[PDB]
Amino acid sequence: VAFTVDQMRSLMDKVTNVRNMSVIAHVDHGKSTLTDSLVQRAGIISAAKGITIKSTAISLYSEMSDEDVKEIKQKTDGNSFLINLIDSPGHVDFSSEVTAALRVTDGALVVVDTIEGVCVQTETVLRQALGERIKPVVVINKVDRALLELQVSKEDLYQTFARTVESVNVIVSTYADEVLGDVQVYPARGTVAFGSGLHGWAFTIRQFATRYAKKFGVDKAKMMDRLWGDSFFNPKTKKWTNKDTDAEGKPLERAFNMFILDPIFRLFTAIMNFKKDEIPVLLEKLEIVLKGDEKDLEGKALLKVVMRKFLPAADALLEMIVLHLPSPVTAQAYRAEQLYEGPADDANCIAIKNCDPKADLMLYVSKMVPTSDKGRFYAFGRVFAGTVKSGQKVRIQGPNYVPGKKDDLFIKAIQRVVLMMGRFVEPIDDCPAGNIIGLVGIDQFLLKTGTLTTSETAHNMKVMKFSVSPVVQVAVEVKNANDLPKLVEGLKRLSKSDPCVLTYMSESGEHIVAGTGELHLEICLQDLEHDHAGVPLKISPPVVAYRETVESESSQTALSKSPNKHNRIYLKAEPIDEEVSLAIENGIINPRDDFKARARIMADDYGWDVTDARKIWCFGPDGNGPNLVIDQTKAVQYLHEIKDSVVAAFQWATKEGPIFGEEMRSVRVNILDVTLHADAIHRGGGQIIPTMRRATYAGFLLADPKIQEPVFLVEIQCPEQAVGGIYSVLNKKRGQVVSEEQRPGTPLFTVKAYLPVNESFGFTGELRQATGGQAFPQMVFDHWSTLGSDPLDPTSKAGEIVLAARKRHGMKEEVPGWQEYYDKL
């Protein structure tokens, strides 16, 4: 169907007839076939009156009768509904991105498989969803498999359905807050559907109940209770019996098999065995009116046409969604506290609970989506409270926001509020609480998630942590030379589609793809090879970012002389405190700031001698890194005339340390004294630069050198009964437990721990084994950690790393000692 913008804004008003949901299915169980079936039947498309985007959500439109509308155990308005099909990841390892998509939904269509049933991953996703208080509704897909492959029987088939329905409710029952209620599924209640995404058909007990009801007078409520379980209609006797063995002890067929499975089973038998005589009368019985062409169809061809006219799989899926899934009004009432990070009595939490469109804004940005509108990204999220309007002055509260501080806060104006119709957007003036909307003009203020509020009081909403630090990289080359041009373009596309990936050319002439972790890199490398570039790619082992630091002050004074022999430099190196290194990294200790102001900050807050601070010559690397060069020289003739070179030499030395070429971190350098030649002609960079270089490299190795490793902060949701499996893995990997807290309703524990990045490879696989896929991981780079080993001792833990690197870089295995940068004098 196609709607103007006014139609949409109308549907959006009646938030009671909206349904925000996602499809929780195994990519291998026909997850997309169904979604396609839905869209093909009810998807919406502005009827209008060239910017494209990455489809993140689709709007569906469904209409029902007044009779059905009365069955909704929920406050509804109108017989029209707007369903929001929000997309979700295809791989469960994506954990963090799953939680995002899920967090903006209130119900889910969980697809289970006929034969295989409830697989492990799907059970995990479902557990998360339930953890979030999302109401499930199930569909047993791929029934055509059991019919065609195994050539099973009606009762067999039935029992499979039955057992599987059990599996699910055991989960749903264990992990469903006592707040949700008996959110367990039942075929007779109309919350379980059956069908085949392939052949495109599907049904619910209810649809057949409505059928046999009219053409036979009886009521449906009763009828659909008999269409499942042990209720029997004996033909001969023409009466219903609750006894499975009737008459003279003969077995009777279960109602489900007799009125639902039998009719279908008869179409599969007739059609595939080409029983030309039957098929025509049969179709007549059920009322399958073939249209011209089709009449000459046969085999799987004809089947995929008959089954469609008979039980339009879509119609059955929409039934459940409308009739059983919660509206924003219903859901937010109990999903509020979990989503609000502040007081459960706050004015905002109350507004979310009441889905109040008059309250201040509370908009949850779950993700940023690539667009064609230049390099822009649009915000995708849900308005939980208030209304968002174009040009609206909004408080953009990023991940590191706190109600008290001013950090990560941005007060800008939303350029435009638009509807996210698949790959198409449609501007709109405003959007009230309860709706899934998009936003233009927040690119430069949010990278992935965030909270948009109007109250200066409002806390953030349960955010999802994500780092932008490229702690891991890999080299990638093409297999077939000629494909090169495609890679170059691919890498450029990869970069445009992801604010955390990074592609570039290395000095060794290699294509580099740096990412956030093994997880992230895996995704990119695939999308690169199959979509972005679409060509066979050669990939190298992962390389982990490291840092070079000093543990103490210099043994002795560093000294070096230009090649001239006419210049010398005297400096010493010492540790820069983490507190201060972070300070530098967080902007607090800024390079542009007033050296006087800056200096005061380092003095009053970081016990720094206000003088030295006033004498910082520069930061490093790139001019802002967490490394300094403090001036402590007394009466030096022409000092200012070599500042540059000294600074330059610092930039070079801090980007490539002397241990194995990595950036330095937390390194302080105090120039003690300088003896320059009198003639400017002999104090040039060619002379100086190398001097301050060796001198810095020298004093570094004299200050008890060490390397730092990036450490992840992993957070795992998991059954209290299996937490043991977690700890088990963490120990086998230098892990360290930070917290282990529980949330009151569910048997679901959450464990937070630090895990070195160099230990994280394969962590997900090993973690699901140790817990039977019951653990749900997610990591974010957190900090740097100094290894206590000796980087120079090839046998130590540190030196083991240092060596593999130098070799990899084709350097000389041994690490040049300071003596080789020192000049005796």
From Swiss-Prot:
May I have one GO cellular component term?
A: ribonucleoprotein complex
List-wise, which residues carry N6,N6,N6-trimethyllysine? K492
In which compartments does the protein localize?
Answer: Cytoplasm
Residues recorded as bearing Phosphoserine in the entry: S562
Mutating Q473E: what's the consequence?
Reduces sensitivity to sordarin
Mutagenesis or variant effect for P542 to L/R:
Causes resistance to fusidic acid and sordarin
PTM summary from the entry reads: (Microbial infection) Diphthamide can be ADP-ribosylated by diphtheria toxin and by Pseudomonas exotoxin A, thus abolishing its function.
Q: Which residues form the tr-type G domain?
A: 16-329
Taxonomically, the superkingdom here is: Eukaryota
Regulation of its activity: Inhibited by fusidic acid and sordarin, which prevent the release of eEF2 from the ribosome after the translocation step. While fusidic acid acts on all eukaryotic eEF2, sordarin specifically binds and inhibits only selected fungal eEF2.
Q: Does the keyword ATP-binding apply?
A: no
Q: PTM N6-methyllysine: list the residues.
A: K492, K596
InterPro entries given in the database record: EFG_II, EFG_III/V, EFG_V-like, EFTu-like_2, G_TR_CS, P-loop_NTPase, Ribosomal_Su5_D2-typ_SF, Ribsml_uS5_D2-typ_fold_subgr
What Pfam families has UniProt attached to this entry? EFG_C, EFG_III, EFG_IV, GTP_EFTU, GTP_EFTU_D2
Any stretches that span the bilayer, and where are they?
none
- Catalyses which reaction(s): GTP + H2O = GDP + phosphate + H(+)
Q: Does the keyword section mention Transferase?
A: no
GO molecular function terms noted in the UniProt entry: GTP binding; GTPase activity; identical protein binding; protein-folding chaperone binding; ribosome binding; rRNA binding; translation elongation factor activity
Summarizing the annotation, the consequence of altering Y504 to D/N/S is: Reduces sensitivity to fusidic acid and sordarin
Q: List the disulfide bonds.
A: none
What's the family?
Belongs to the TRAFAC class translation factor GTPase superfamily. Classic translation factor GTPase family. EF-G/EF-2 subfamily.
> Any idea what job this protein has?
Catalyzes the GTP-dependent ribosomal translocation step during translation elongation. During this step, the ribosome changes from the pre-translocational (PRE) to the post-translocational (POST) state as the newly formed A-site-bound peptidyl-tRNA and P-site-bound deacylated tRNA move to the P and E sites, respectively. Catalyzes the coordinated movement of the two tRNA molecules, the mRNA and conformational changes in the ribosome.
Assembly behavior: Binds to 80S ribosomes. Actively translating ribosomes show mutually exclusive binding of eIF5a (HYP2 or ANB1) and EFT1/eEF2. Interacts with the 40S ribosomal subunit protein RPL9A; the interaction is direct. Interacts with the 60S ribosomal subunit proteins RPL12A; the interaction is direct. Interacts with RPS23A; the interaction is direct. Interacts with 18S rRNA; the interaction is direct. Interacts with 25S rRNA; the interaction is direct. Interacts with RPL0. Interacts with STM1; promoting ribosome inactivation.
| General remark | Present with 160782 molecules/cell in log phase SD medium.
Q: What is this protein called?
A: Elongation factor 2
Q: Which gene encodes it?
A: EFT1
